[PDB]
Amino acid sequence: TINQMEISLKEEEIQLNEATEKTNQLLANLDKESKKANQKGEEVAATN
């Protein structure tokens, strides 16, 4: 039983780290895209 619960914790923790890395990098990419979008929208509002 000790081995079983250890294995489950190990695999679920590494999967959690993978999914959290996925969640993090997407947020940074989205923040960069949002900064560019807001600057270009201000430029468009100016131009119109």
Partner 1 sequence: LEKAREDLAQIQAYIKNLKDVYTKQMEEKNELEMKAAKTKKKINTART
CB of 11 to partner 1, least distance (A): 9
Sites of contact with partner 1 (CB under 8 A): 1-2, 5-6, 8-9, 12-13, 15-16, 19-20, 22-23, 26, 29-30, 33-34, 36-37, 40-41, 43-44, 47-48
CB of 33 to partner 1, least distance (A): 6
CA atoms within 13 A on the CB side of 42: 5
Instruction: Give residues with Cβ within 8 angstroms of 12, minimum separation 6.
Output: none
For residue 39, the tally of other CB atoms under 10 A from its CB is 10
